[PDB]
C-alpha cells in the first residue's frame with residue numbers, strides 16, 4: 001500500500017466520441033505538474049480511469065516535484081484547457097543504476113486511440129535520454145501488458161531484474177501479479193518523438209515538443 005498496489009480499472013461506460021472531431025488544428029502543450037491546480041487536474045483525469053489507485057492513493061502518487069524523485073507531466077488541449085494524457089514517474093539513482101519507473105499513465109475520455117499515449121511515451125523516453133537515465137521500467141498488470149508491449153517495452157530478463165531486486169522490492173511501485181517490463185534508453189530512436197507527433201492527426205504542439213524539469 002506504500003510500495004504495493006493493484007490495478008482496478010473503472011467499468012462505467014465512457015463516451016468514446018472523438019474530442020478532435022472538429023476541423024482546423026488542435027493546439028496542445030506539454031507541462032509538468034508544479035501547482036496544486038495542475039495536480040488536481042491530473043488526479044481528476046486519472047480518477048476517471050482507475051478505481052484503484054483510489055482517490056487517496058492518487059493524491060499520494062501525484063505530487064509536486066522535489067534528476068530525482070516524483071514527476072507528473074501532462075498534455076493539455078489549449079482550445080478546451082482539458083487534460084488529454086498524463087504520466088507519473090519516479091526517478092531512481094541507486095548505486096550505478098539510474099532508472100525510471102512509471103506508476104500511472106492515462107489518456108482521457110474522448111482522446112483514446114488517437115496516438116496520444118505513444119506521443120506521451122515518446123516524450124518521456126526522450127526526456128530519460130536527455131537526463132542521465134539508462135532504462136524505463138514498468139510494473140504491468142496483465143491488463144496493461146498489451147499496451148506497454150505495443151509501446152515497445154519487453155519483459156525484463158530475470159538476470160537484469162535480480163541485479164536490482166532488493167532495491168526494487170523495497171522502493172518501486174509494484175502492481176499485484178504484475179510482469180516487470182523495460183526499455184533501455186540507448187535503444188530509443190532520436191526521431192521517436194517526431195514520428196509519434198506525425199501520427200497524431202490534427203494536433204500541433206506549442207512550446208517545447210517534449211518534457212521539461214521546471
Ligand SMILES: CC(=O)SCCNC(=O)CCNC(=O)[C@H](O)C(C)(C)COP(=O)(O)OP(=O)(O)OC[C@H]1O[C@@H](n2cnc3c(N)ncnc32)[C@H](O)[C@@H]1OP(=O)(O)O
Pocket residue numbers: 007049050103104105106107108111112113114115116117118119144146147150151
Ligand atoms: C496503472 C496504469 O497506469 S496502467 C497503464 C495504462 N493505463 C490504463 O490502463 C488507464 C486506462 N487506459 C488508458 O488511459 C488508455 O487506454 C491507454 C493509456 C492504455 C492507451 O492510451 P492511448 O492514447 O489510447 O494509446 P495510443 O492511441 O497512443 O496507442 C499506443 C499503442 O498502444 C496500442 N493500444 C492502444 N490502446 C490499447 C489497449 N486498450 N490495449 C492494448 N493496446 C492498446 C495502440 O494500438 C498503439 O500500438 P500500435 O502503435 O502498435 O498501434
